[PDB]
Design a protein around this nucleic acid. Structure first.
Lengths: 136, 115, 76, 188
RNA sequence: GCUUGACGAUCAUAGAGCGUUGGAACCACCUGAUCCCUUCCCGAACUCAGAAGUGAAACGACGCAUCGCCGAUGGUAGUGUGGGGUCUCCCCAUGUGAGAGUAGGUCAUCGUCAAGC
RNA sequence: CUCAACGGAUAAAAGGUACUCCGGGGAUAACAGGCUGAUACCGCCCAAGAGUUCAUAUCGACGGCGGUGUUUGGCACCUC
RNA sequence: UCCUAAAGAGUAACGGAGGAGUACGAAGGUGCGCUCAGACCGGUCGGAAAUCGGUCGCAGAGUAUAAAGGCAAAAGCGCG
RNA sequence: CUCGAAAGCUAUUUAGGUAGCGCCUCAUGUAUCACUCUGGGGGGUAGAGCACUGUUUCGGCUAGGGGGUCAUCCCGACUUACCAAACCGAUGCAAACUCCGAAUACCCAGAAGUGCCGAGCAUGGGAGACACACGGCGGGUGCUAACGUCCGUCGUGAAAAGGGAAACAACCCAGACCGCCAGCUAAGGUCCCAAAGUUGUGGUUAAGUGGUAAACGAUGUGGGAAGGCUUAGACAGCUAGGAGGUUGGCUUAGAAGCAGCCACCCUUUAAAGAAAGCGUAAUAGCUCACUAGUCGAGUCGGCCUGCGCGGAAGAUGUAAC
């Protein structure tokens, strides 16, 4: 799916996900957008699954922007493995998202079809999202 | 310039050493025209007095030679005998120690002005 | 492919902060390469340790071009 | 366009945060000119009905605190990132003889009769709306028209290809950064 | 008194970028290396006998504000303490409080010293 | 020289025990209990799709959200 | 040596990243001399690129060695 | 009777032992100490930022290879269908990034007051400890799982009883010298078990919600802003609805308004989708809009927010007030 092509380090910490998305919150490239209203994580096959629901529902045209990008490595321990024998290996990638972050954007589409497209997209996402328009 | 900065690229260490150390300073000027001298005392920023080669006694025409550099060695020295230090320190100032630079300098040692 | 082996944590930093009385030998900044520079009466040791060479109080000015953070001691 | 306003003689974090949840107000300021900035409180019910209008930002909007009135401009409104309501409207004044920079929205009128839409199959690509201008206040436009009745499949209309009210300086043409305003592109 | 020197206070509100100039004093060249020497080969380096020439280049002050650089107010994020909640997070009281952004200054402000007008 | 087990037991140091013995421990494993639920198991949500037409009679890719404590774990809390 | 480490020190994990068990009689002192890299280009053997000649340069170079922190009053080379 | 720890750091053939230092006590000296205020002072974390080292995403741009290439037995090359690092702008994100940058904490100086009569320090006598626990906060590790585990910093238990949380080391309140059949409060409570309001005013909720729960789903109801249709008569309900030629398509029991294939306006004139789809699976019966005389009215959709409803299955017995 969506990875960085390289990374400086193979592992990050766990970290936290605090604050609001004061950046990433405006519809910067399209006319309509799926903005998240709750915080969470998107495991890069939630990214692609909602992307495939969008492009398939429009069926004629329009340009679609993917504003989110999974950049941090997430590491699991396998089974039959005791705690603490070094940090486990990377499995997937995750974008840390805040309330207010624009996830997807679209143009060239009617306002009734964009709501029907981002409702297909939001059902494949573990977030509480919303539909927004371009403001100014 | 290519000339004025590359000597102030060389005039760098003693520039700021004698303000750390607070001792006497001899802000001279040489050129293809002239050979000057002017002295600053033991604090980095105090002018003593001035003495040019535009001074009243030797504007005779061969101004600023190595003949006319040894005339400057006893010249600002009398102006620094109202100052009150025996030794005096050497601004190289990007003026390479081969010509009028030392001939103002080494004529001060006989001229009551020690290094 | 194996991690461990951190070092033993050299205790660097500004000792004797910027209003304090000094005596004329005091280590004034332990330092890993002159993050602070040498002002009026301070010394700059071999490993860039700043040390007071006179008595007084330490000032911590910012001065000059290059944005040097200076440590100078004023005999007050 | 008229806004009612009040005095707002108490400032801070927890004060401004309790106007929004108890009183239902928004904080604001007018500051612009060579004059004294003034803190202003204002109602959220009426500032959202002004932002309903298509020409909210690129239009002289009247405002009164009491009997005092000003030719006011909306300069850099602030917004809740999550729920999208207005906090801190942040207005300007108008001194009627300087250049008074603002944002002016776009129209893109002739999109049905386009040589890259009709004959050759292509769709439009809005890259930029709401260009930021600098114009004397009597020549403060609501709109800037963008004509796309001759752009072909592959042709790019820039801001160099743009237009009207002629007394309106575009800020991006003042530098070498010429911006691409729309496209007609082949479909996916 | 101004022109300009000579090291310095202050350090991109002082910085770069686009015209006019100064010849007398200063300043760069210039004429050449004979007598000092400079050369990883050289007098453009630099050492100089110099003052035959020259003010454009060279630099110097002196022009002009696009750009960098400073930058309010107000808000916001954060946060010490005390208390809540639906507690991987926020809210309330209270104290504090940015960063980024938002009219625009400006071809800076100083200090001693001197030859000349 | 050699203490790299790098504050260096001695100049000089490998194993077996299912034939075992003693002193202790639930400061610590195996069984079972407990905490948790990755894992397993069972539901549910959107529905690209197949179902000869027709998403929802059956089935459902991509992802989503929960429940049960039902076993593989993880923990070492009780029990040597 | 950096991170974790919570803007004074310090601070754990079979946590995440790399290194050392030396070099140097000059690679030190000092005297003296002296300042990068980059794109831009000139093809008869190198033509992405050298020899380097000179135009816009705007530390991005270099430091015996890891990383951090530092530098021009050089904290790189030449030579006595 | 008075005081009162620690379960830390460093070293260890050491890890449940020990040693020095920290913490306790006693004695003897001696003059500091704490809190707060005002004043100095460094910082690079939170946040934020993209100027650096990296990672992002989409507009724009130049060289060039030459994919395409009229191709000259071999040149000149038309030409930009492929593409092309860098540059311009817009847009993200880092523990090992920083042009920036706090609150707090820490260091210092000077001050009032308070200190239980001392707090601080120094030398000596005696120790004990050197397996900590849980809770809040700030993080690593794990699955931002665990009454998991490793640090920082607090509070508590250890070593602290009493009242509350039904019961419940570690949570909330509060720190018990002894007596009292005195009174005020704290947390928490006031219908009965059970001490105190069946207290007052104003609302909400019909589920026993209260008194366990997620995506998501519904004319459940309360409140609030707005909008379009609104008596020239709207949304669900009545007695006129109806084109003047000649197969709009490669198919041939059988191919409209629903087959792997797609769709926007010309009248005798007040008159209307060469169509979004349940139909007598298909053809000879029939359903969302009226530029309208006639029955005559307040409606139809969304958003914000209050409390509720399904989603909701478990093993001894009601059994999560």
């Amino acid at each position: 799916m969506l990875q960085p092509k390289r990374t400086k380090f193979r592992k990050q910490m766990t970290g936290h996900n605090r604050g609001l998305a004061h950046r990433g919150s405006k519809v910067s490239f399209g006319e309509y957008a799926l903005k998240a209203t709750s915080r969470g994580r998107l495991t890069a096959r939630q990214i692609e699954s909602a992307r495939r629901a969008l492009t398939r529902h429009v069926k004629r045209g329009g340009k679609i922007w993917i504003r989110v990008f999974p950049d941090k490595p997430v590491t699991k321990k396998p089974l039959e493995v005791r705690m603490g024998k070094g940090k486990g290996g990377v499995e997937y990638w995750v974008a840390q998202i805040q309330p207010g972050k624009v996830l997807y954007e679209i143009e060239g589409v009617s306002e009734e079809l964009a709501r029907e497209a981002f409702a297909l997209a939001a059902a494949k996402l573990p977030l509480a999202t919303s539909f927004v328009k371009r403001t100014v | 310039s290519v000339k004025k900065e590359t000597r102030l690229r060389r005039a760098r260490k003693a520039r700021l050493k004698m303000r750390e150390l607070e001792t006497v300073r001899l802000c001279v000027y040489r050129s293809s025209q002239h050979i000057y001298a002017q002295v600053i005392a033991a604090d980095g920023g105090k002018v003593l007095a001035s003495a040019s080669t535009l001074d009243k006694d030797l504007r005779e025409g061969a101004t600023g030679n190595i003949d006319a550099a040894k005339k400057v060695g006893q010249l600002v020295a009398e102006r620094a005998k109202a100052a009150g230090v025996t030794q005096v320190a050497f601004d190289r100032s990007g003026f390479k120690y081969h010509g009028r630079v030392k001939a103002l300098a080494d004529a001060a040692r006989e001229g009551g002005l020690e290094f | 492919t194996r991690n461990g082996r951190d070092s033993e944590s050299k205790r660097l930093g500004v000792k004797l902060f910027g209003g304090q009385a000094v005596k004329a030998g005091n280590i004034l900044v332990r330092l890993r390469g002159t993050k602070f520079h040498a002002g009026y009466g301070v010394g700059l040791g071999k490993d860039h340790t700043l040390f007071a060479k006179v008595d007084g109080v330490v000032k911590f000015e910012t001065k000059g071009a290059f944005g040097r953070k200076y440590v100078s001691i004023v005999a007050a | 366009f008229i806004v009612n306003a009040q005095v707002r003689s108490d400032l801070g974090k927890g004060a401004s945060r309790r106007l929004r949840r108890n009183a239902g107000l928004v904080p604001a300021v007018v500051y612009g000119g060579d004059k004294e900035p003034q803190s202003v409180t204002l109602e959220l019910r009426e500032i959202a009905k002004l932002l309903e209008n298509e020409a909210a930002f690129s239009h002289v909007i009247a405002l009164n605190v009491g009997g005092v009135k000003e030719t006011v401009l909306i300069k850099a409104l602030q917004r809740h990132p999550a729920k999208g309501f207005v906090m801190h409207a942040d207005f300007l004044r108008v001194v009627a003889d300087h250049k008074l920079t603002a944002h002016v929205p776009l129209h893109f009128i002739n999109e049905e009769v386009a040589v890259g839409v009709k004959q050759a199959g292509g769709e439009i690509s809005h890259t930029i709306s709401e260009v930021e201008v600098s114009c004397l206040p009597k020549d403060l436009p609501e709109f800037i028209e963008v004509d796309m009745a001759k752009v072909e499949l592959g042709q790019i209309v820039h801001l160099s290809d743009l237009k009207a009210p002629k007394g309106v300086e575009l800020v991006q043409l003042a530098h070498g950064n010429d911006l691409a305003v729309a496209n007609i592109h082949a479909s996916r």
